[PDB]
Amino acid sequence: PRANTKIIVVGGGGTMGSSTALHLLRAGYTPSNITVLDTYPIPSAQSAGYDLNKIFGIGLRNKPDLQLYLEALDMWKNDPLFKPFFHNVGQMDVSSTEEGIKKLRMRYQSLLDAGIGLEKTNFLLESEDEILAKAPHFTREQIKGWKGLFCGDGGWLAAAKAINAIGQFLKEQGVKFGFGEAGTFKKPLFADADEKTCIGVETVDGTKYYADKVVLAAGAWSSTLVDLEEQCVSKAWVFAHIQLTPAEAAAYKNTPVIYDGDYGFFIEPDENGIIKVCDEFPGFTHFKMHQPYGSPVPKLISVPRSHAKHPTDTYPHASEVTIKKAINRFLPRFNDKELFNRAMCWCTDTADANLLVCEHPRWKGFYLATGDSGHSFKLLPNIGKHVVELLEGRLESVFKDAWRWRPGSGDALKSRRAAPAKDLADMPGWRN
Ligand SMILES: *Cc1cc2c(cc1C)nc1c(=O)[nH]c(=O)nc-1n2C[C@H](O)[C@H](O)[C@H](O)COP(=O)(O)OP(=O)(O)OC[C@H]1O[C@@H](n2cnc3c(N)ncnc32)[C@H](O)[C@@H]1O
Ligand SMILES: O=C(O)CSC[C@@]1(O)OC[C@@H](O)[C@@H](O)[C@@H]1O
Numbered sequence: 001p002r003a004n005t006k007i008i009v010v011g012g013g014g015t016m017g018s019s020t021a022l023h024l025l026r027a028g029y030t031p032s033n034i035t036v037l038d039t040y041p042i043p044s045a046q047s048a049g050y051d052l053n054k055i056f057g058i059g060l061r062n063k064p065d066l067q068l069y070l071e072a073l074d075m076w077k078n079d080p081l082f083k084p085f086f087h088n089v090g091q092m093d094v095s096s097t098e099e100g101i102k103k104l105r106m107r108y109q110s111l112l113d114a115g116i117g118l119e120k121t122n123f124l125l126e127s128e129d130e131i132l133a134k135a136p137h138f139t140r141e142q143i144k145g146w147k148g149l150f151c152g153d154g155g156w157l158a159a160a161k162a163i164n165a166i167g168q169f170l171k172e173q174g175v176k177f178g179f180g181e182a183g184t185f186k187k188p189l190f191a192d193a194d195e196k197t198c199i200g201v202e203t204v205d206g207t208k209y210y211a212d213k214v215v216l217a218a219g220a221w222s223s224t225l226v227d228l229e230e231q232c233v234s235k236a237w238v239f240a241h242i243q244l245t246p247a248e249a250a251a252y253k254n255t256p257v258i259y260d261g262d263y264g265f266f267i268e269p270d271e272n273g274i275i276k277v278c279d280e281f282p283g284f285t286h287f288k289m290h291q292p293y294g295s296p297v298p299k300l301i302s303v304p305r306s307h308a309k310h311p312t313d314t315y316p317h318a319s320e321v322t323i324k325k326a327i328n329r330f331l332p333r334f335n336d337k338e339l340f341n342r343a344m345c346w347c348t349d350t351a352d353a354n355l356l357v358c359e360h361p362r363w364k365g366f367y368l369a370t371g372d373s374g375h376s377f378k379l380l381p382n383i384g385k386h387v388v389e390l391l392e393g394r395l396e397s398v399f400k401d402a403w404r405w406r407p408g409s410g411d412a413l414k415s416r417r418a419a420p421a422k423d424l425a426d427m428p429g430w431r432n
Helices: 015-027 065-078 098-113 130-135 160-172 220-226 246-250 319-330 383-392 397-402
Strands: 007-012 034-037 054-056 091-095 122-124 147-151 156-157 176-178 185-190 199-202 208-210 213-216 233-243 257-260 265-268 276-278 287-290 300-303 340-349 354-359 368-369
Touching: 007 156, 015 034, 015 160, 015 368, 034 319, 054 065, 054 176, 054 300, 091 130, 091 340, 091 354, 098 122, 098 147, 122 130, 130 147, 176 276, 199 213, 213 383, 220 233, 220 340, 220 368, 233 300, 233 319, 246 319, 257 319, 354 383, 368 383
Parallel strands: 007 034, 007 213, 034 176, 091 257, 213 368
Antiparallel strands: 054 156, 091 147, 122 147, 185 199, 199 208, 233 276, 233 340, 257 265, 265 276, 287 300, 354 368
């Protein structure tokens, strides 16, 4: 039964892992029976979710995406734990190119084709006046030739704060923790030499933890820890910050997230006047020598270069260029603002950008909860619910089928993005 079942959540200080730990508690698992093992205390300083903010927006790329999004939305609006961290300011995608405007229009049509009434809260903006109505900080000259798609249900998420809120609850309830070397997964433990029954994990300090079930929610590190047979390729994206005075920030209060696929995006200034800017690009790998467990030999693998461990890193020179291009596009009045807290942030792509959430094909009792594919912070409130369903054999097929073990199902270096990721070894400037 749930109350007598012991679970280890590897990466439980991160997004999918903390969600999982939360939902084990909500399901009635005994807190002292749950062990979170993360290199960093929750919220993990190297988690992709350890961020001022993230966008919450609708995507309809894969079969489970609509249901997952609606499920998350309901919780971001209505769950008392999560609702303080959702800012429903909406989002406006924009473009001034022929191809970009075509994509905008096709995206809108795809929402409509779901047939559930999404046209009530999503709108094509075909004129300057309509765009300025939603985003009054723009100038008319600035947006000449732009078209927009306004999604009224989205906005932004206070990401680190939300994971911290889960963490405060886990600790209040008496969930057990290991951090540092005692929290850093090294290998699964097995009952027999055939490795068909997982009974726990060993961390790099040698500490052994025994449990009925193990969840590997290690984000961009998952592929380095166990052999995922090239299903997941980890990549970095980048952000920088600029600091506004209260008077500068005033025109941006409650303004929608602004996104252009050719540039990137920015989010409204936070309570301290900070605007985060990201560019848009296919990500950076960091291939290095590494042996994951389950591979008989080392494999070339994209291993995250962790900013928390190496806070003197920033990002490549090429990233400075594209982030400044986004600033010129969206915020040209702030072209002279200094960029700071530049960082790389790590995700792991699958070939089709569906998650990888499944029992290991051989190691019974060991479960994967990863393949975030750079779009899963928005699933913080609900993804753990389905990981628990998977643990219990109750995961419905729409999710189970999409999330299944699937080596050889496509090239995750390119994934659903515009090009195979370039590698940091070829991109000067980030060691700075
Ligand atoms: C990088 C990025 C991602 C991103 C974004 C902008 C950037 C720059 N904007 C987003 C947005 O607007 N909307 C959205 O939905 N997502 C956005 N993302 C993506 C999002 O950040 C990720 O998809 C998501 O956060 C992934 O979560 P996941 O749980 O998979 O990864 P994690 O949060 O990083 O957690 C992994 C944890 O694992 C721990 N770890 C690592 N190694 C170990 C070992 N060996 N043992 C134990 N624990 C380990 C890490 O410390 C981390 O806590
Ligand atoms: O999934 C969303 O609604 C926003 S994801 C934001 C982002 O920075 O996350 C990291 C990568 O996936 C980037 O391509 C991507 O634009």
